mmCIF file with all atom_site columns, C-alpha atoms in Angstrom:
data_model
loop_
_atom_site.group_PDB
_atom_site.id
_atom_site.type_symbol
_atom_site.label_atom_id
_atom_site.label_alt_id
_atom_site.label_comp_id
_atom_site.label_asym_id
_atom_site.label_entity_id
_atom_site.label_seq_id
_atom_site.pdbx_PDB_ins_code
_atom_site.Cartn_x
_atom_site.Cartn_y
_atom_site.Cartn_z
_atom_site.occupancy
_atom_site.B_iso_or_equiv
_atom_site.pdbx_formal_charge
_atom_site.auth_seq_id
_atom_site.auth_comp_id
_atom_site.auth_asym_id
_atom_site.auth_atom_id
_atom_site.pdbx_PDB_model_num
ATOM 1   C CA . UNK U 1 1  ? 0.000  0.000   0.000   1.00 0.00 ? 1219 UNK U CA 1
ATOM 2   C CA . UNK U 1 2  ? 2.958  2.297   0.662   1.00 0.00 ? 1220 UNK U CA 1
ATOM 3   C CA . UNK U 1 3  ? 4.202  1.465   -2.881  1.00 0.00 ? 1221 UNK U CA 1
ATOM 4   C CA . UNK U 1 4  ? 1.117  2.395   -4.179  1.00 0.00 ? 1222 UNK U CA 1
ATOM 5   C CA . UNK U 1 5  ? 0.694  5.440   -2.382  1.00 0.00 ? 1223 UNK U CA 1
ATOM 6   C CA . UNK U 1 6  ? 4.727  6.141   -3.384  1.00 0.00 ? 1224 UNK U CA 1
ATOM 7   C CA . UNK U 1 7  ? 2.923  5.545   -7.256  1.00 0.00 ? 1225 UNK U CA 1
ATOM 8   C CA . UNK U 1 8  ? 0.344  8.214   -6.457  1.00 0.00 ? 1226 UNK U CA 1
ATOM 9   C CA . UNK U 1 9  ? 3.612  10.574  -5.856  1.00 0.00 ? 1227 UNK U CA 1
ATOM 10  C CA . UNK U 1 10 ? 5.018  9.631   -8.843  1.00 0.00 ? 1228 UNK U CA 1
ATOM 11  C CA . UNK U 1 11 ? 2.042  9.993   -11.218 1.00 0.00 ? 1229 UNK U CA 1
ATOM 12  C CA . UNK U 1 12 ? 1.692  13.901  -8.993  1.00 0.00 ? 1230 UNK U CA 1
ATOM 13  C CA . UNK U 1 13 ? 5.158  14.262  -10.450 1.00 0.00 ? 1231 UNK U CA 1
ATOM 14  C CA . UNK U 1 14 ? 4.054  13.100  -14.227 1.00 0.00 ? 1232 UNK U CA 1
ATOM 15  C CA . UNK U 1 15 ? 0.671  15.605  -13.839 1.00 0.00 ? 1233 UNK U CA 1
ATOM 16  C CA . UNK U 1 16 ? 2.772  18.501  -12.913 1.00 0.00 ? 1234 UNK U CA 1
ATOM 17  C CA . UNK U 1 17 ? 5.681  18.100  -15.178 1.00 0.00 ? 1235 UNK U CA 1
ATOM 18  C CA . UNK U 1 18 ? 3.545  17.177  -18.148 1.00 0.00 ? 1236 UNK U CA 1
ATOM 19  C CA . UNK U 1 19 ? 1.403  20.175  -17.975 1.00 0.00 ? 1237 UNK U CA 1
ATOM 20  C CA . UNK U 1 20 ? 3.539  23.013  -17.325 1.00 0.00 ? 1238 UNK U CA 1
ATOM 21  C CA . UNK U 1 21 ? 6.188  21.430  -19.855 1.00 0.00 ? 1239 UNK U CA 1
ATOM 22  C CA . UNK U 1 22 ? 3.226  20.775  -22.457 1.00 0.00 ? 1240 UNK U CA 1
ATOM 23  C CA . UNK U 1 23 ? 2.262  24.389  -21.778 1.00 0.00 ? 1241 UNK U CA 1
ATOM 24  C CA . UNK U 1 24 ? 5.523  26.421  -21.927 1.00 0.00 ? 1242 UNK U CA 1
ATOM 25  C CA . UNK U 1 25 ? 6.460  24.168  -25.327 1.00 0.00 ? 1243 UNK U CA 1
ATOM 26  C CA . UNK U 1 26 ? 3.212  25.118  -26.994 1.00 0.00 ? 1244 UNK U CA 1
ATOM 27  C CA . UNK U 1 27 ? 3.829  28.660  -26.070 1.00 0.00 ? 1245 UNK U CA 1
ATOM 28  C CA . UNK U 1 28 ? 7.325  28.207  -27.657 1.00 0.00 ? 1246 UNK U CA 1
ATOM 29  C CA . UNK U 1 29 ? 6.433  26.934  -31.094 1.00 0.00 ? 1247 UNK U CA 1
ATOM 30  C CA . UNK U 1 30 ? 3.990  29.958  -31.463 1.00 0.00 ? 1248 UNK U CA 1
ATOM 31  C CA . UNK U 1 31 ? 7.065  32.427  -30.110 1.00 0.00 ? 1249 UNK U CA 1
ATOM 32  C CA . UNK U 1 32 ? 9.121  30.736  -32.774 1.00 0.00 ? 1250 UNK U CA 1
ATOM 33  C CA . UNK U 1 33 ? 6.462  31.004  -35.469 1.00 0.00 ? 1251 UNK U CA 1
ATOM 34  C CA . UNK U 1 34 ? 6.260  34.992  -34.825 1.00 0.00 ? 1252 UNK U CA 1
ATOM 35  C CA . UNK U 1 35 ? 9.552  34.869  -34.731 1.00 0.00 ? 1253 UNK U CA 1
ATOM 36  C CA . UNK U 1 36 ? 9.968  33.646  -38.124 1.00 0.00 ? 1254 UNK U CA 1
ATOM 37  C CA . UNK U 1 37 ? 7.159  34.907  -40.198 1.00 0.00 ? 1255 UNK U CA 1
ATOM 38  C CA . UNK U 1 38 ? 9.259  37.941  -41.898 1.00 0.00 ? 1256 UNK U CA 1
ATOM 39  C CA . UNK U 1 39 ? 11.571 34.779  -42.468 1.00 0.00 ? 1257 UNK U CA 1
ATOM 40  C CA . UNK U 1 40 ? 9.059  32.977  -44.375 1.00 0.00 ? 1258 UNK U CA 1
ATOM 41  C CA . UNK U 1 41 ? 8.402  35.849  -46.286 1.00 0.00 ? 1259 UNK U CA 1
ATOM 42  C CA . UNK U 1 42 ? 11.862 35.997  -47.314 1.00 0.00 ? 1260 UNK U CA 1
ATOM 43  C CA . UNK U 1 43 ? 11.574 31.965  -47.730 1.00 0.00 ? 1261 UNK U CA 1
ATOM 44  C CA . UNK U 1 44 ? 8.784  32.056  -50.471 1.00 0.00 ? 1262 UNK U CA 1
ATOM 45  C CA . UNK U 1 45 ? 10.906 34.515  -52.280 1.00 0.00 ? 1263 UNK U CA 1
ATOM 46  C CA . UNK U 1 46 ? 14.072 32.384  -51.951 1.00 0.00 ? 1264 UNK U CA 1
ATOM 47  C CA . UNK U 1 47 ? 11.939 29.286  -53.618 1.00 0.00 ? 1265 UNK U CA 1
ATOM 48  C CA . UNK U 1 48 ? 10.392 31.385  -55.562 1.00 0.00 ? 1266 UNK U CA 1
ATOM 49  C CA . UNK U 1 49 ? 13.620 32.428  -57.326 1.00 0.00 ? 1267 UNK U CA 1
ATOM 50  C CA . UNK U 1 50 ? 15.030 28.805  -57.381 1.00 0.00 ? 1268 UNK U CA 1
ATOM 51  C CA . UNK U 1 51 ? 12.371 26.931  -59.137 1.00 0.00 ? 1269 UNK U CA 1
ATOM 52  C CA . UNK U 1 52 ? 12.597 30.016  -61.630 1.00 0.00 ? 1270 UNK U CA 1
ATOM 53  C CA . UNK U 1 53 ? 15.747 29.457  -63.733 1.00 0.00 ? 1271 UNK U CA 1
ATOM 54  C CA . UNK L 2 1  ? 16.475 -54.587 40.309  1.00 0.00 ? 325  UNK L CA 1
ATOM 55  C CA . UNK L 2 2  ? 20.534 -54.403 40.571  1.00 0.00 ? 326  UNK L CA 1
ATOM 56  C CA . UNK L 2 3  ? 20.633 -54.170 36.128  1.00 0.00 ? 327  UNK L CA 1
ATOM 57  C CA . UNK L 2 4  ? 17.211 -52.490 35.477  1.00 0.00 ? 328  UNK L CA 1
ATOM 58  C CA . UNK L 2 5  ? 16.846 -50.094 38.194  1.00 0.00 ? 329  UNK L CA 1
ATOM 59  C CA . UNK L 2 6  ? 19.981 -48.286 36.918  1.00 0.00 ? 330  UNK L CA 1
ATOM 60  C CA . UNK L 2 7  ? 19.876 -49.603 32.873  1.00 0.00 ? 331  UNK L CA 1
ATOM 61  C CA . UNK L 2 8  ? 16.295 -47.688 32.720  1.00 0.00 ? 332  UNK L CA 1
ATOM 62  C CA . UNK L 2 9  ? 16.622 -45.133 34.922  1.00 0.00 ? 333  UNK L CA 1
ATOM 63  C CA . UNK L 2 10 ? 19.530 -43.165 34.425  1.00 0.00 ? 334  UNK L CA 1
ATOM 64  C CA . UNK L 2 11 ? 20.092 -43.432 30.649  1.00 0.00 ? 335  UNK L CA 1
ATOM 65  C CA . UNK L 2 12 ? 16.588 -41.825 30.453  1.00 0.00 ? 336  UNK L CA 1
ATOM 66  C CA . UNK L 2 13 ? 17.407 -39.132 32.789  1.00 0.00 ? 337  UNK L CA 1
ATOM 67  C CA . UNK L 2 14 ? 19.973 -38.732 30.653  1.00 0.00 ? 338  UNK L CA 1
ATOM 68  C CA . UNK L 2 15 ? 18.582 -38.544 27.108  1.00 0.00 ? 339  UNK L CA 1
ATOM 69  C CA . UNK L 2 16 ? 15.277 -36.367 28.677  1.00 0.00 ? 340  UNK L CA 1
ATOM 70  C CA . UNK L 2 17 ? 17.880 -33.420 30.028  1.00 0.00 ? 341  UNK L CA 1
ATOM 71  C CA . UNK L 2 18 ? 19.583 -33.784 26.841  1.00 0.00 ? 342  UNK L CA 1
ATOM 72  C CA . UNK L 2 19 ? 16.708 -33.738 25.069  1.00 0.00 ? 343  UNK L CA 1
ATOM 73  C CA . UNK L 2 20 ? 15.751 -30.259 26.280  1.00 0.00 ? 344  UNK L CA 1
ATOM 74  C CA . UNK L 2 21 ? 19.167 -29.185 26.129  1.00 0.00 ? 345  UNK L CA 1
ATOM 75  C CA . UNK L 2 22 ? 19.252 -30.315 22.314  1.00 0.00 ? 346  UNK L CA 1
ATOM 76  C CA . UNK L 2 23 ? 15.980 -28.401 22.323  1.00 0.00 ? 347  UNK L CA 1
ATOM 77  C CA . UNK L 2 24 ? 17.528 -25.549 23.436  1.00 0.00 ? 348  UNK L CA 1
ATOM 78  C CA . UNK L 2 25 ? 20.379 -25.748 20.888  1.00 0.00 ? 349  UNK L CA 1
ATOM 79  C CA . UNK L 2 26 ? 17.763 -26.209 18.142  1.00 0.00 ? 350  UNK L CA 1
ATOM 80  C CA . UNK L 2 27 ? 15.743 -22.555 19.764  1.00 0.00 ? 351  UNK L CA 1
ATOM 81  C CA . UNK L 2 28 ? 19.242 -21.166 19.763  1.00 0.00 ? 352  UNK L CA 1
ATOM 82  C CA . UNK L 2 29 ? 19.346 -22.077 16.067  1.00 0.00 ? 353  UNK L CA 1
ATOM 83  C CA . UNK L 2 30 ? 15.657 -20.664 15.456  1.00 0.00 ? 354  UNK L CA 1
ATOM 84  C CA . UNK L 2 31 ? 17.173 -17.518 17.157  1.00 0.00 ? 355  UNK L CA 1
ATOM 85  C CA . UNK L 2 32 ? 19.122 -17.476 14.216  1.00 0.00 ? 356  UNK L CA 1
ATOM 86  C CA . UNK L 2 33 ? 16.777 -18.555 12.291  1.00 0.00 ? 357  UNK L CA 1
ATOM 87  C CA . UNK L 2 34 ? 15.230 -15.028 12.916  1.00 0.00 ? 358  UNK L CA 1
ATOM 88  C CA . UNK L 2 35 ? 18.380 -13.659 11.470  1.00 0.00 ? 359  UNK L CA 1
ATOM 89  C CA . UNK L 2 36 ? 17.736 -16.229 8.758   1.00 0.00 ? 360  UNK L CA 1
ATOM 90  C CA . UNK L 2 37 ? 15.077 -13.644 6.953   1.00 0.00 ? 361  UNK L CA 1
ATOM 91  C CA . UNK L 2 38 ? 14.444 -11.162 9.455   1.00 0.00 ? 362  UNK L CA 1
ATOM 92  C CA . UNK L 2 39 ? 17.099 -8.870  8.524   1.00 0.00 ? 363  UNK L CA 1
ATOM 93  C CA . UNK L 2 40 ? 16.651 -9.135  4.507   1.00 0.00 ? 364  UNK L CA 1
ATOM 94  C CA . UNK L 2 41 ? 11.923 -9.007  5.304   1.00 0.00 ? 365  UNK L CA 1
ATOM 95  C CA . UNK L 2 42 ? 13.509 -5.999  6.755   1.00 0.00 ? 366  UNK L CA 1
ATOM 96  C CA . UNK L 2 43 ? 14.988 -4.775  3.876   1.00 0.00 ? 367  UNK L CA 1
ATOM 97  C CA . UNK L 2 44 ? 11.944 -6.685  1.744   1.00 0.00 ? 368  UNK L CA 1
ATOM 98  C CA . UNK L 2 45 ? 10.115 -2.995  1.538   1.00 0.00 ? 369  UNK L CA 1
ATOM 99  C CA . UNK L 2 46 ? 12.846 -1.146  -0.207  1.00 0.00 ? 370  UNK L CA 1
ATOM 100 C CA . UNK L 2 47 ? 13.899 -3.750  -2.042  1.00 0.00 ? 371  UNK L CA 1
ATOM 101 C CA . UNK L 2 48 ? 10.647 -3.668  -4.056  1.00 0.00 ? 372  UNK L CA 1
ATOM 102 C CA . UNK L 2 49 ? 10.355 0.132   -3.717  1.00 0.00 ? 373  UNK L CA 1
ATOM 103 C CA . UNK L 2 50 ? 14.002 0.668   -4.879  1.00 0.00 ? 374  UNK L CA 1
ATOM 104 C CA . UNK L 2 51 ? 14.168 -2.639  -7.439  1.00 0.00 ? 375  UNK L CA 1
ATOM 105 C CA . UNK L 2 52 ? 10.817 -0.690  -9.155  1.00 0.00 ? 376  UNK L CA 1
ATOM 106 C CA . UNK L 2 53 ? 12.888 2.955   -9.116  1.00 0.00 ? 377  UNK L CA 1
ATOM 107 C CA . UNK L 2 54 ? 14.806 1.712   -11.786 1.00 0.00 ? 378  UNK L CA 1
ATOM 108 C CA . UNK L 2 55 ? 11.437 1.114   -13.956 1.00 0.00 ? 379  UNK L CA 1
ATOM 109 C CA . UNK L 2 56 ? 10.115 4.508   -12.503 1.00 0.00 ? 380  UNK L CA 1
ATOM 110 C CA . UNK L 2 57 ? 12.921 5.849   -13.584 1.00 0.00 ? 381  UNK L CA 1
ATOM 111 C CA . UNK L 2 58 ? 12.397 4.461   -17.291 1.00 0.00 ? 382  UNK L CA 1
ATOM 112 C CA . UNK L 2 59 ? 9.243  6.502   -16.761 1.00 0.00 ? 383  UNK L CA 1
ATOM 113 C CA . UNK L 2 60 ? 10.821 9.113   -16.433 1.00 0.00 ? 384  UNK L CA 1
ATOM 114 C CA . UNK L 2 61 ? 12.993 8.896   -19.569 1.00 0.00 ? 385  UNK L CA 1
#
């Protein structure tokens, strides 16, 4: 039962970790898609001048 | 009576006190047989606490 209750600590551990983790990474792949939108910009016009030769 | 009274008697005197005295060693030996798995039963509860860390801990990889 103490194992179990040890488990219940553990999977606390999982719940809090998870989340906030979960959160502040899906926060950082929108501050990294801001952050590169000018870049995609530039992007399209770098394909745009390969694939015309 | 001269034989018997000593060739029963006293040989069973004998083997009764060393019966309990052999029963004595023997308790000695379940004293020890405590030991025997007392001090690992001890140990029993983090041995499957820490034996399952490792396996928590491939939860947490």
């Amino acid at each position: 039962l103490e194992v179990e209750a040890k488990l219940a600590e553990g999977r606390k551990k999982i719940e809090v970790e998870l989340q906030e983790a979960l959160g502040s990474l899906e926060q950082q792949k929108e501050d990294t898609i801001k952050s590169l939108d000018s870049q995609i910009s530039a992007l399209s016009d770098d394909i745009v001048k390969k694939v015309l030769p | 009576t001269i034989r018997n009274s000593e060739e029963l008697r006293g040989k069973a005197i004998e083997q009764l006190e060393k019966a309990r005295a052999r029963l004595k060693k023997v308790e000695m030996d379940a004293d020890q047989f405590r030991v025997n798995g007392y001090s690992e039963i001890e140990r029993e509860k983090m041995n499957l606490i820490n034996s399952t860390y490792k396996t928590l801990e491939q939860f947490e990889n």
